[PDB]
Amino acid sequence: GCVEVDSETEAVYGMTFKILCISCKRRSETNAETFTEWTFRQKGTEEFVKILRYENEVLQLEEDERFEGRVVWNGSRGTKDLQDLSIFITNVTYNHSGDYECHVYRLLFFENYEHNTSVVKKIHIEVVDKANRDMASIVSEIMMYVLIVVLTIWLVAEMIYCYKKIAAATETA
Amino acid sequence: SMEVTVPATLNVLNGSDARLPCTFNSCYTVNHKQFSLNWTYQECNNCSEEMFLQFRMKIINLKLERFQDRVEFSGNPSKYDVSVMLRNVQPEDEGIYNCYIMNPPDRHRGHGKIHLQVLM
Amino acid sequence: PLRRISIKILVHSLFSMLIMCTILTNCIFMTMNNPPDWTKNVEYTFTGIYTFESLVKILARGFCVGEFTFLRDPWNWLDFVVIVFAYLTEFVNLGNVSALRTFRVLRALKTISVIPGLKTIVGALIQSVKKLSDVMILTVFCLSVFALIGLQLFMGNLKHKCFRNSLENNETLESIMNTLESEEDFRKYFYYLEGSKDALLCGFSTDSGQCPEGYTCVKIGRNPDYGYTSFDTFSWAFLALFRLMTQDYWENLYQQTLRAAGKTYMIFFVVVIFLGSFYLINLILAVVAMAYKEQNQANIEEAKCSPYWIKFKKCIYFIVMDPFVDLAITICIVLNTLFMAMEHHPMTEEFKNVLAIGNLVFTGIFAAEMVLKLIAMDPYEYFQVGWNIFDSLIVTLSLVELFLLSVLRSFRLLRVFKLAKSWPTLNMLIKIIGNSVGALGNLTLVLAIIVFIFAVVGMQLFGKSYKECVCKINDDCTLPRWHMNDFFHSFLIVFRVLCGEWIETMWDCMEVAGQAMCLIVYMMVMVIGNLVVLNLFLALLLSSFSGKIWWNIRKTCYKIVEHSWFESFIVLMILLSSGALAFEDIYIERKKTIKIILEYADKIFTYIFILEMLLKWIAYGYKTYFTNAWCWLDFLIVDVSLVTLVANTLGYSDLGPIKSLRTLRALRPLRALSRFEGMRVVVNALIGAIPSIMNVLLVCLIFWLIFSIMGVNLFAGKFYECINTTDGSRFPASQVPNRSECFALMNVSQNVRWKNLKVNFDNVGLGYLSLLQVATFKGWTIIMYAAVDSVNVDKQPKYEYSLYMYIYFVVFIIFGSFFTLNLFIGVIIDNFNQQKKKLGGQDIFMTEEQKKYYNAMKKLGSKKPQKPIPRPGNKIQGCIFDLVTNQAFDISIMVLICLNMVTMMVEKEGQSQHMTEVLYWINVVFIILFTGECVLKLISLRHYYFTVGWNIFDFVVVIISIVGMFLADLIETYFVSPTLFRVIRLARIGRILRLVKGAKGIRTLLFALMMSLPALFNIGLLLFLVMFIYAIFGMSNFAYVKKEDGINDMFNFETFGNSMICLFQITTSAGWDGLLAPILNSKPPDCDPKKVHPGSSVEGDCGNPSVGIFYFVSYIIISFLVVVNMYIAVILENFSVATE
Ligand SMILES: *[C@@H]1O[C@H](CO)[C@@H](O[C@@H]2O[C@H](CO)[C@@H](O)[C@H](O)[C@H]2NC(C)=O)[C@H](O)[C@H]1NC(C)=O
Ligand SMILES: *[C@@H]1O[C@H](CO)[C@@H](O[C@@H]2O[C@H](CO)[C@@H](O)[C@H](O)[C@H]2NC(C)=O)[C@H](O)[C@H]1NC(C)=O
Ligand SMILES: NC(=O)OC[C@@H]1N=C(N)N2CCC(O)(O)[C@@]23N=C(N)N[C@@H]13
Ligand SMILES: *[C@@H]1O[C@H](CO)[C@@H](O)[C@H](O)[C@H]1NC(C)=O
Ligand SMILES: *[C@@H]1O[C@H](CO)[C@@H](O)[C@H](O)[C@H]1NC(C)=O
Ligand SMILES: *[C@@H]1O[C@H](CO)[C@@H](O)[C@H](O)[C@H]1NC(C)=O
Ligand SMILES: *[C@@H]1O[C@H](CO)[C@@H](O)[C@H](O)[C@H]1NC(C)=O
Ligand SMILES: *[C@@H]1O[C@H](CO)[C@@H](O)[C@H](O)[C@H]1NC(C)=O
Ligand SMILES: *[C@@H]1O[C@H](CO)[C@@H](O)[C@H](O)[C@H]1NC(C)=O
Ligand SMILES: *[C@@H]1O[C@H](CO)[C@@H](O)[C@H](O)[C@H]1NC(C)=O
């Protein structure tokens, strides 16, 4: 079922990027209605200007130029109880860099209890010119090779020592 | 079926107090809103019934003119008890006394019938 | 003179028969349940016959001598009781007629006296019970210790409920509780999981949980199950544990506590089920079986025109043609059954007719041979043979079908047995059935008599209550499916209890009939009823049973493979390789870093294994390498991994296979089997028995097929019903009687669905699955309700229309499960016996090293006397030694421990402070006295004290006990964390364990358990590996299935920890039916094929019906095979210890 996964923090310039904000209800069985707000403050500047609001099925987008155009909803569709809210940007630009805060509003319907809750997920992304390979990927690949080389060296090493001994035994008798 | 225990005939001296004792028994635990008890009197076998006391949330004594203020409730229903007391019995009190008990959730309605006879 | 006449009357052929005939008739009358008024006179006559029968015996035997002859026999005491009782009732009697009347059932017991040889069987049964005295003591003690551990660890836990956070009008949790008492009222306030009887159980820890947001967890109110399921009091805890031991609906207790308690406590259940249930039950079987052999064997040892007909008639006899004509017919019979196997709910009109045409030909051929058969040997000669008469009845039935209960028609399939004569194993099954009504007929008859008495007794005692109460038990105000109101129904409940299904029904009886009465009756049926069933099973089973530089290189590689570091290094890789498997699952997306290393890590593993395999080829060569079973397994695994790696590097991946192939990885732990010596030994034993198992399976399959075919004709296509989708409640049938009517409702109504069961009798293959559930008793009841309810193929089912179809299930259970299981168990244990004989009479469940150790444990059995010790010279030292040495002093300590044990029992939930303080203080005195005893033994004994093993255990217990009290105290001062504290107190239970030292009988049994630990460990290791492979297959395959029944948050296949919890639960095959059900549904509207699943790539939550069925079924069978193995190990050791 639903799992919470943190969004990627580096977006290549001039390429599409997807921001992931996923919020999971404590109990899957319960049914509630959700809506979301994403506010972004550009790097080097204080505060957040709400950029988009998604309620019902239609997505409302603020008129600011930084994000004018370039945004599409990648969230749960037709559910009306979103669970997963994600924003996808086409044609990523430097202007799209900084801190992103996404707040979720959920109406939970219980037997005689109606509960309104707020959870805040904030995503911070920095634009870079060229995709940078993750350090974990690089360390592991280099690390894996060393093991492959060391083991083989060890295996070959025994044979030179073991084999010579075996050859020696035949001659003695 | 509600279990009802009453004396079929109750003989009481004129001027004494007559406790009309009936036992109602059914499964479950009695509920105040749920438990309802009704008592009616008849001068004779074929005679019209006159309700004189009810339990609906609490005891309601209808204060029928024929009894003056001589009727009292005399039972703790939670105990399956719904007895009534007729103080200072008079000859005109002779007749048939009916106890009807309907107890939710029990669908069945209990009925006890006492023939009260007044001595001399 | 009169005495002679009476005496003459007393011993007569007819009189015994006359007394007996009336009694059987009397039994039919008890079954009335509201007999007419006219029947009362008949009641008087029965009273008359007994007095007359009773009077003569007393008149002749007594000689007016005090009835010395008459009352000397024990059975006669029973008759006197019955006569007075019938008579006493007319006389002034006690208030409860039903309680008093129940005695009349005693007359049924008289039947035991009248039938010849029955008296002997009952006596035989009582003798067996005597042997069970030691096991009973241990069982009570064992249940008692667990009850104490359970109570301390889980008391008050079942209470948790989710209480909502915001309350209007300044209400308080305390204020709310007293004022309201209604399910509707309660629901508004606490969570309640969509129609469950009670509130959802919540938990404090991260592992357990969880309550929806806006609801908080607090503990208040009654425990679930009417308050019956709770760990609050010792008595209640004892009932909960007893249920676990007999494994009745044990899965729910397990699921419920884990949820409130948290998953970490799953450990408690593993130890209890593994030691408490599998082991304790086995001990009972061994003792009953062992006891039966001595008595059975001991008793056995003491004994030791006209002329034309003849011409034509002679020709017919030549026509018997045993070499070919007789043989030819059997091929025909096998073919016929196969023909019958083809049926389905939906059958085309042309196909339906073809089946009819085909049947007639077969019916005709069987009759012609019979008519033809008659001419050749003559009628008298013809009916001489039993099979012939058997064949004749079937043929006659078919002829009648054409013109003159069509079900009987379905009956010709039995004919299939005829093959029994040719088959060695089938002959055995035929033999087993015969023994029950043959030599063992008297014993089997007793079972029938006992079931009858209980059904009637239950009916008399609780029949009235169920009707009046109904509501306490049912929301609707109508009788539940299982009730004690009628004899057939009362009988069904008793039969259910024979299978271990007692708890579900008992809660119902208790609500209506009260705790004291319901508990006593059910407990007796279970203990007494089961003992008879156990005796029949065991009795039946036992009786039935009896340059050339290349050469140097080749030599060297051989050196490398043989070397220990390499063998050792390879094993480490296997464990490590297997472990990486556990990490993958739904949560892998999170923790992206671990995912990257694991992906890379596998490549190094693939290279190492491929490298290792090459060394194997050079060292062994191809011929040696491929003639080994293990290597093929090993060679095959590397290949699957190798193909994925080559395909993966290349790209061109994810196109089904190879992608399906990736799922095959779960097989990686499989190479581990060869490496471990312990695991391999167990596997060798199973391979030895597969051929033997195969033979029994064939008989089971053929036998089950007849039941399955029979079932298909009766219920095929009749399980459909129109149900309200919101609550899944079938419509009344007053409206929407047929399928056609149901559809009209849908057109004008949104949520009404016409739907099938999912496990049913639509086709022969499905019938096999339905039968499997009934055989195991899991998921069986849903099916039975469907069968009885059913009316016709396209018609809505009426409630309990068939009612007598229950009989079909009862017959299958007796034949399908009781007999085959008898056969399955008999062959497997025997095969194991042959294996033991072959390998020099040595246990086949232990590695060679284990064998040396097993012998050392055997040495502990010896009683050679240890040195007495010398009193120290000092008198002061000596008197203490003198006092300590005395046996009387030791008995006092034993009494003291028992006193200590009773103190623990008094503890209960919400006891109060004054109560709590006294218990704490009494406990301190106990610690001081016990510590005091230890010091005293030490002063006198000195170095000698340390010599005894028991003294050391006693000394260790004291150290643990003082520390436990102090640490709890330090913890209280330090504070923070209640949970560490409860576990700390568990130390006191240590003193109770010392009781074992005192009882000689219990110790022998305990010693036996210790002896089998080495064998049990190997099986446990093998079992764990199989469970592990399955968990991995499950994680990939079943995560994402829609959550329905048995699958919910927790107890789901989403992660490895979760998968393990489920697999352990199903090992006992409990709830296996529930888990399988979500997997079965495929396609709308059962499920959505493409579902978003936020945070993951995968789409849809549809179980694979084919893959799911193979997986659950295979697991059930495999676990069962290993468990059969566990019983064999316990029995072998038990015979040896008892034998010594
Ligand atoms: C199927 O069952 C549902 C669930 O009870 C029924 O829905 C109820 O209908 C009545 C009257 O239409 C409403 O007052 C209740 O509120 C409904 N329950 C809820 C909670 O929705 C429904 O009537 C049934 N379907 C049909 C066609 O009868
Ligand atoms: C299936 O059930 C329906 C419903 O009763 C039967 O069709 C008719 O039902 C209507 C009510 O709408 C009655 O007026 C008719 O009398 C019913 N049929 C007849 C001939 O009386 C129908 O017969 C049932 N059987 C089917 C359709 O196979
Ligand atoms: N309904 C059914 O199959 O009846 C048998 C019994 N009763 C239940 N309510 N169960 C819950 C699930 C289950 O497996 O069906 C079962 N769990 C066990 N141990 N036996 C089953
Ligand atoms: C990028 O930012 C600059 C200044 O912050 C602004 O003038 C420009 O319009 C932005 N780009 C777009 C496409 O709006
Ligand atoms: C996210 O938006 C892109 C824009 O085209 C769309 O193609 C993609 O399918 C969306 N995500 C999903 C639900 O696959
Ligand atoms: C990105 O924006 C530029 C304008 O600066 C536009 O020409 C280009 O088409 C955009 N990229 C894509 C993939 O459309
Ligand atoms: C709760 O619901 C109300 C609707 O009455 C809405 O105005 C409010 O914003 C919600 N609360 C939150 C925290 O969004
Ligand atoms: C009140 O008494 C009458 C007798 O006339 C009876 O019919 C009725 O059921 C009683 N009311 C209730 C609520 O039981
Ligand atoms: C608590 O209950 C009292 C009733 O005595 C009420 O007057 C008061 O308003 C309640 N408190 C709150 C915070 O509502
Ligand atoms: C609903 O019944 C109406 C009759 O008014 C019919 O026209 C319609 O086709 C039916 N619905 C379906 C899905 O067949």
Q: How far is residue C649's CA from residue C643's CA, in Å, rounded to a whole number?
A: 10
Q: Which long-range contacts (CB under 8 A, 24 or more apart) does C195-199 make?
A: C195/C727, C197/C224, C198/C222, C198/C224, C198/C225, C199/C161, C199/C162, C199/C224
For B107, name the nearest residue in chain C, comparing CA atoms only: C477
Least Cα distance to B38 among B10, B67, B62, B14 occurs for: B62
- CB-based contacts of C709, cutoff 8 Å, min separation 6: C337, C340, C341, C410, C413, C764, C767
Q: How far is residue B84's CA from residue B20's CA, in Å, rounded to a whole number?
A: 5
Q: How far is residue C259's CA from residue C240's CA, in Å, rounded to a whole number?
A: 16
Whether ligand 3 lies within 6 angstroms of the CB of C251 is answered as yes
Query: Which residue in the set C164, C559, C607 is minimally distant from A148, CB to CB?
Result: C607
Q: List the structure tokens of C908.
A: 């209960």
> Cβ separation of B27 and C477 shorter than 8 Å?
no
∠ CA C463-C468-C472 to the nearest 5 degrees? 105
Map tokens 């064949």 to a residue.
C391
- 3 state SS for C339-373: HHCCCCCCCCHHHHHHHHHHHHHHHHHHHHHHHHH
Cis (ω within 30 of 0) for the bond into C850?
no
Whether ligand 2 lies within 6 angstroms of the CB of C741 is answered as yes
Map tokens 């809506």 to a residue.
A35
Q: How far is residue C917's CA from residue C484's CA, in Å, rounded to a whole number?
A: 47
Query: Which residue in the set A3, A6, A143 is minimally distant from C587, CB to CB?
Result: A3
Whether ligand 2 lies within 6 angstroms of the CB of C738 is answered as yes
Q: Are the beta carbons of C666 and C805 closer than 8 angstroms?
A: no
Q: Are the beta carbons of C1068 and C1093 closer than 8 angstroms?
A: no
Least Cα distance to C762 among C718, C805, C705 occurs for: C718
Q: How far is residue C147's CA from residue C145's CA, in Å, rounded to a whole number?
A: 5
Residue numbers in C near A136 (CB within 8 A): 593, 596-597
CA distances from C133 to C303, C529, C1140 (A): 30, 18, 18
Ligand 8 centre to CA of B72 (Å) is 18
Helix axes A135-172, C592-626, angle to 10 degrees: 20
Whether ligand 5 lies within 6 angstroms of the CB of A74 is answered as yes
Q: How far is residue C214's CA from residue C784's CA, in Å, rounded to a whole number?
A: 41
Q: List the structure tokens of A104.
A: 């979720």
Q: List the structure tokens of C656.
A: 């089904």
Ligand 4 centre to CA of A93 (Å) is 9
Q: Where are chain A's structural domains?
A: 1-173
Map tokens 């079937």 to a residue.
C394
- CB-based contacts of A170, cutoff 8 Å, min separation 6: C552
Q: How far is residue B58's CA from residue C970's CA, in Å, rounded to a whole number?
A: 57
Closest ligand, as measured to the CA of A87: 5
User: Which atom of ligand 8 is the closest one to the Cα of B56?
Assistant: 13
Whether ligand 8 lies within 6 angstroms of the CB of B49 is answered as yes
CA distances from A32 to A26, A83, A116, C715, C1043 (A): 12, 10, 9, 43, 18
Map tokens 């009189």 to a residue.
C15
How far is C-alpha C1121 from the geometric centre of its chain's CA atoms? Answer: 14
Q: Are the beta carbons of A57 and A114 closer than 8 angstroms?
A: no
Q: Are the beta carbons of C419 and C426 closer than 8 angstroms?
A: yes
Chains that touch B (3 or more CB pairs under 8 A): C
Q: Atom 7 of ligand 7 has which residue's CA nearest to it?
A: A116
- CB-based contacts of C496, cutoff 8 Å, min separation 6: C482, C502, C505
How far is C-alpha C670 from the geometric centre of its chain's CA atoms? Answer: 29
Cis (ω within 30 of 0) for the bond into C1094?
no
C63: left (phi over 0), alpha (psi -120 to 50) or beta: left
Q: Which long-range contacts (CB under 8 A, 24 or more apart) does B109-114 make?
A: B109/B2, B110/B1, B110/B2, B110/B3, B110/B4, B110/B24, B110/B26, B111/B2, B111/B4, B112/B4, B112/B5, B112/B6, B112/B22, B112/B23, B112/B24, B113/B6, B113/B8, B114/B6, B114/B7, B114/B8, B114/B9, B114/B10, B114/B20, B114/B22
Could you please report the per-residue DSSP string of C150-174?
A: HHHHHTTGGGEEEEES--GGG--HH
User: Which atom of ligand 3 is the closest one to the Cα of C250?
Assistant: 19
Cis (ω within 30 of 0) for the bond into C520?
no
Q: Are the beta carbons of C258 and C1104 closer than 8 angstroms?
A: no
Chain C residues with CB under 8 Å of a chain A CB are 164, 166, 187-188, 191-194, 209-215, 552-553, 555-557, 559-560, 586-587, 589-590, 593, 596-597, 600-601, 603-604, 607-608, 611, 1040, 1043, 1049, 1054, 1092-1096
Homologous superfamily of the B1-120 domain (CATH): Immunoglobulins (2.60.40.10)
Which backbone phi and psi does C38 adopt, to 5 degrees?
A: -60, -30
Ligand 2 centre to CA of C737 (Å) is 9
Q: How far is residue C527's CA from residue C128's CA, in Å, rounded to a whole number?
A: 13
- 3 state SS for B67-93: HCCCEEECCCHHHCECCEEECCCCHHH
Q: Are the beta carbons of C289 and C538 closer than 8 angstroms?
A: yes
Which backbone phi and psi does C870 adopt, to 5 degrees?
A: -110, 135
- 3 state SS for C463-496: HHHHHHHCCCCCCCCCCCCCCCCCHHHHHHHHHH
Q: Are the beta carbons of C1031 and C998 closer than 8 angstroms?
A: no
CA distances from C153 to C272, C890, C899 (A): 14, 32, 22
* DSSP letter assigned to residue C795: B
Least Cα distance to C540 among C814, C835, C303, C246 occurs for: C814
Cis (ω within 30 of 0) for the bond into B105?
yes
- Hey, how many other C-beta atoms are within 10 angstroms of the C-beta on C44? 10
- CB-based contacts of C157, cutoff 8 Å, min separation 6: C231, C257, C260, C261
Q: Atom 11 of ligand 7 has which residue's CA nearest to it?
A: A116
Least Cα distance to C177 among C131, C127, C125, C220 occurs for: C220
Helix axes C39-62, C74-90, angle to 10 degrees: 140
Encode burial over C644-677: b for 16+ CB neighbours within 10 A, e otherwise.
Answer: beebeeeeeeeeeebeeebebbbbbbbbbbbebe
Q: List the structure tokens of B55.
A: 């339990």
In the chain, the amino acid numbered C186 is: F
Ligand 7 centre to CA of A118 (Å) is 9
Torsion angle of C-alpha atoms C821, C825, C828, C829, degrees rounded to 10 = 180
Chain C interface mutation, best of A2, A111, A114, highest count of C Cβ atoms under 10 Å: A111
Encode burial over B67-101: b for 16+ CB neighbours within 10 A, e otherwise.
Answer: beebbebbbebeebebbbbbbebeeebbbbbbbbb
Q: How far is residue C802's CA from residue C791's CA, in Å, rounded to a whole number?
A: 7
Chain C closest-CA separation from residue A65 CA (Å): 30
Q: Are the beta carbons of C485 and C459 closer than 8 angstroms?
A: yes
Q: Are the beta carbons of C485 and C467 closer than 8 angstroms?
A: yes
Q: List the structure tokens of B91.
A: 């000859």
User: Which atom of ligand 3 is the closest one to the Cα of C773?
Assistant: 3
Tell me the structure's resolution in angstroms, rounded to a single decimal: 3.2
How far is C-alpha C404 from the geometric centre of its chain's CA atoms? Answer: 45
Chains that touch A (3 or more CB pairs under 8 A): C
> Cβ separation of C1094 and A30 shorter than 8 Å?
no
Residue numbers in C near A76 (CB within 8 A): 1092, 1094
Residue numbers in C near B27 (CB within 8 A): 465, 468-469, 471-472, 512
For C1053, name the nearest residue in chain A, comparing CA atoms only: A1
Q: By what technique were these coordinates determined?
A: cryo-EM
CA distances from C98 to C462, C656, C966, C1131 (A): 9, 70, 58, 45
Q: Are the beta carbons of A148 and C604 closer than 8 angstroms?
A: yes
* Burial of C953 from C-beta contacts in 10 A (0-12 / 13-18 / 19+): middle
Q: Are the beta carbons of A162 and C559 closer than 8 angstroms?
A: yes
Question: What DSSP element (H or E) covers C318?
Answer: helix C306-318
Question: Strand A10-12 vs strand A114-128: parallel, antiparallel, or unpaired?
Answer: parallel
In the chain, the amino acid numbered C724 is: N
CA pseudo-torsion sign A44, A49, A55, A60: negative
- CB-based contacts of A165, cutoff 8 Å, min separation 6: none
> Cβ separation of C469 and B28 shorter than 8 Å?
yes
Q: Are the beta carbons of C1132 and C1009 closer than 8 angstroms?
A: no
Q: Are the beta carbons of C1117 and C1067 closer than 8 angstroms?
A: no
* DSSP letter assigned to residue C222: P
> Cβ separation of C477 and B26 shorter than 8 Å?
no
Question: What DSSP element (H or E) covers A28?
Answer: none
